[PDB]
């Protein structure tokens, strides 16, 4: 996330840009992930579980949507 | 026999020595009835990251249909030769005679 302040650019704006860049990188997230050792099994489980959740969100909810709430 | 594709990188202070080296390499290939389908001196080039403390290096591409013994020999030569920093002998299916996109 290397950044250079442009000529006649505000500080705040620059900071914001930097933040955005960082977010894009996913650096903080990566750091968080590597704080502690995740057993392979655990890693697998999370990934599959997450996937399942995503699938549920996509399809079941869509089905629900077809019918009106009131 | 087997169509290899070689790219080796020479140290930029030895850039005037490069042609001779290339010739030598070619000669060896020829020796075992090996063809050399393309050969492209890319020249001095800025490295994406400084390998062995230096920022530029001299890239040579070379495509060869040769037996594997000769390839092995070439590799050995590269490894011991201190002028050549990196090499990357790399198999290929066909002869691929047409020029590279960075030459064009």
């Amino acid at each position: 996330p290397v950044i250079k302040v442009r000529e006649n650019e505000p500080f705040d704006v620059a900071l914001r840009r930097f933040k955005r860049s960082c977010e894009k990188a996913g650096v903080l997230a990566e750091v968080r992930r590597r704080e502690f050792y995740e057993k392979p099994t655990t890693e697998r489980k999370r990934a599959k579980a997450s996937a399942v959740k995503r699938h549920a969100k996509k399809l079941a909810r869509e089905n629900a949507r077809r019918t009106r709430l009131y | 026999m087997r169509h290899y594709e070689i790219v080796f990188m020479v140290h930029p202070d030895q850039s005037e020595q490069v042609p001779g080296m290339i010739e030598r390499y070619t000669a060896a290939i020829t020796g075992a009835e090996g063809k050399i389908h393309r050969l492209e001196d890319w020249g001095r080039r800025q490295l994406a990251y400084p390998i062995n403390k230096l920022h530029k290096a001299h890239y040579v591409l070379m495509n060869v249909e040769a037996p594997q013994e000769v390839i092995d020999e070439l590799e050995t030569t590269f490894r011991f030769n201190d002028a050549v920093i990196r090499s990357m002998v790399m198999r290929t299916k066909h002869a691929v005679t047409e020029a590279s996109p960075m030459v064009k």
């Binding site: 996330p1 290397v2 990188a25 | 990188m9 490295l47 990251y49 990357m88 996109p101």
Partner: protein
């Protein structure tokens, strides 16, 4: 919306650095096939090419390193 299907390329080239550069991050990382919309078969090839390039110092492993 894959590029390589439309172009109809047989194999992605590590030497074709410019092309690679579209699929690499500002931070050097290889861009996901969700974002680029690259076909799966091609994506792997592209990745491989990028890796090769990195070995040859044609592409950088990362933005920071020097």
């Amino acid at each position: 919306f894959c590029r390589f299907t439309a172009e109809g390329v047989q194999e992605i080239d590590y030497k074709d650095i410019a092309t690679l550069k579209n699929y690499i991050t500002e931070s050097g990382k290889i861009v996901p096939s969700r974002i680029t919309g690259t076909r799966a078969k091609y994506q792997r090839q592209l990745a491989r090419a990028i890796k090769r390039a990195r070995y040859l110092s044609l592409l950088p492993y990362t933005d920071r390193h020097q």
